[PDB]
Amino acid sequence: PPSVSEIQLMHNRGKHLNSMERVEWLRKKLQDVHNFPPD
């Protein structure tokens, strides 16, 4: 489980900075904001 699976295999995360990951997944995870139409 290398960098290709540091997402699904690694939930411990924090593998580089990840702060660049977070702010992105916020919008696909917080409640994933794409659900505005899919309400």
From Swiss-Prot:
Residues 22-36 are annotated as: Important for receptor binding. It comes from the Eukaryota. It is found in: Secreted. Transmembrane segments: none annotated. Interacts with PTH1R (via N-terminal extracellular domain). Parathyroid hormone elevates calcium level by dissolving the salts in bone and preventing their renal excretion. Acts by binding to its receptor, PTH1R, activating G protein-coupled receptor signaling. Stimulates [1-14C]-2-deoxy-D-glucose (2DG) transport and glycogen synthesis in osteoblastic cells. Belongs to the parathyroid hormone family. It is linked to Hypoparathyroidism, familial isolated, 1: A form of hypoparathyroidism, a disorder characterized by hypocalcemia and hyperphosphatemia due to a deficiency of parathyroid hormone. Clinical features include seizures, tetany and cramps. FIH1 inheritance can be autosomal dominant or recessive. This is Parathyroid hormone. It comes from Homo sapiens. The chain holds residues 32 to 65 of 115 of the full protein.
